[PDB]
């Protein structure tokens, strides 16, 4: 996250870190005791057998007893087009069920077809890069964004930080976009570099896939 702030410890217990031998590379969202969802372009190019699903984390630099780590058991896609990043969503079945506690909880999804109007206030988050020569985040970052329909495909939910250059970046892909306590978006791609101030950040529209998500996690 570029231009964000540190999140409160375990403020978003559904936040997931996808890691390859201890190294963070994408985010995800716990949508069931044994299901997370992320961006399809996160798992499409990595070795899935080495992917580790880290739940209940906050600072990736430190040992954390609150962490629960799982492996991927099966992959579910829905017409993922890697060329245009269309339907950039993926569901990962875990090799077990997570233990629900104060630090690990299931996220809430909106209804199928729910559209977010222009100007709705949302919150983006992730453990991604912090900007040009700003390094990478160790503590979970969060950022206030505003939903926009301009410079945005109908197959996407786009957000923009009004008044300053800020947004999601590499490593934030797959992280949730929380609006009204519901996961309306999955961080997909930026344009003109991170925090460009010209293009809005594009998210995968979870609301358009709720019927497909339910058909798998139920
Ligand atoms: C930056 O963003 C934060 C957080 O964003 C909100 O929460 C996330 C999870 C998403 O759902 C976003 O869509 C939300 O906007 C904002 O803090 C929130 O500010 C609003 C005011 O604009 C607060 O709303 C109050 O809610 C009171 C009841 O709280 C309970 O219910 C709300 C949902 O209605 C729920 O979000 C909250 O956690 C409680 O469960 C209500 O009595 C009061 O009248 C008012 O409506 C909201 O509580 C704040 N949330 C938090 C976590 O602090 C910031 O305002 C925003 N910055 C700017 C500048 O706008
Ligand atoms: C579900 O999968 C997890 C993760 O599996 C790990 O990650 C994968 C990507 C692959 O690389 C796997 O080879 C790898 O194990 C399993 O968690 C892991 O289980 C093993 C065996 O129980 C743990 O090994 C132990 O580790 C402790 C230290 O905590 C040592 O003291 C032991 O001697 C032993 O080496 C391993 O630590 C653990 N991973 C983590 C991060 O704790 C999990 O068991 C599996 N669940 C099921 C039901 O299959
Ligand atoms: C960048 C991370 C470097 C790294 C660290 C630890 C362990 C492995 C890797 N390095 C990969 O992780 C690479 C990344 C590439 C961009 C180079 N990636 C793979 O090694 C890989 C393995 C198997 C598959 C099978 C397919 S094919 C398909 O269509 N969907 C799949 O999952 C794909 C990629």
Curated annotation (Swiss-Prot):
GO terms for biological process: acute inflammatory response to antigenic stimulus; biosynthetic process of antibacterial peptides active against Gram-negative bacteria; defense response to bacterium; extracellular matrix disassembly; intracellular calcium ion homeostasis; leukocyte migration involved in inflammatory response; negative regulation of chemokine production; negative regulation of chemotaxis. Its EC number is 3.4.21.37. Glycans are attached at residues 59, 95, 144. It comes from the Eukaryota. One of its GO terms (cellular component) is cell surface. Disulfide bonds join 26-42, 122-179, 152-158, 169-194. Changing residue 52 to P: In SCN1 and CH. Bone marrow cells. Neutrophil. The active site is at 41 (charge relay system), 88 (charge relay system), 173 (charge relay system). One of its GO terms (molecular function) is protease binding. It is found in: Cytoplasmic vesicle, Phagosome. It is linked to Cyclic haematopoiesis: Autosomal dominant disease in which blood-cell production from the bone marrow oscillates with 21-day periodicity. Circulating neutrophils vary between almost normal numbers and zero. During intervals of neutropenia, affected individuals are at risk for opportunistic infection. Monocytes, platelets, lymphocytes and reticulocytes also cycle with the same frequency. Belongs to the peptidase S1 family. Elastase subfamily. Serine protease that modifies the functions of natural killer cells, monocytes and granulocytes. Inhibits C5a-dependent neutrophil enzyme release and chemotaxis. Promotes cleavage of GSDMB, thereby inhibiting pyroptosis. Promotes blood coagulation. Through the activation of the platelet fibrinogen receptor integrin alpha-IIb/beta-3, potentiates platelet aggregation induced by a threshold concentration of cathepsin G (CTSG). Cleaves and thus inactivates tissue factor pathway inhibitor (TFPI). This is Neutrophil elastase. The gene is ELANE. The chain holds residues 30 to 247 of 267 of the full protein.
């Amino acid at each position: 996250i570029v231009g964000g702030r540190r999140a409160r410890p375990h403020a978003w217990p559904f936040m997931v870190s996808l890691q390859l031998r201890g190294g963070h590379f994408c985010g995800a969202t716990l949508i069931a005791p044994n299901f997370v969802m992320s961006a399809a372009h996160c798992v499409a190019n990595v070795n899935v057998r080495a992917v580790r699903v880290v739940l209940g984390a906050h600072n990736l630099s430190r040992r954390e007893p609150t962490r629960q780590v799982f492996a991927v058991q099966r992959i579910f896609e829905n017409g993922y087009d890697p060329v245009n990043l269309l339907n950039d969503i993926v569901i990962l079945q875990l090799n077990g069920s997570a233990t629900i506690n104060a630090n690990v909880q299931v996220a809430q999804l909106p209804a199928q077809g729910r559209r977010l109007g222009n100007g709705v206030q949302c919150l983006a988050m992730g453990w991604g890069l912090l900007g040009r020569n700003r390094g990478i985040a160790s503590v979970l970052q969060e950022l206030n964004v505003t939903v926009v329909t301009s410079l945005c495909r109908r197959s996407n939910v786009c957000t923009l930080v009004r008044g300053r250059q800020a947004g999601v970046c590499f490593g934030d892909s797959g992280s949730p976009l929380v609006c009204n306590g519901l996961i309306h978006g999955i961080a997909s791609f930026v344009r003109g570099g991170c925090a460009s101030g010209l293009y809005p950040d594009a998210f995968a529209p979870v609301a358009q896939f709720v019927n497909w998500i339910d058909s798998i996690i139920q």
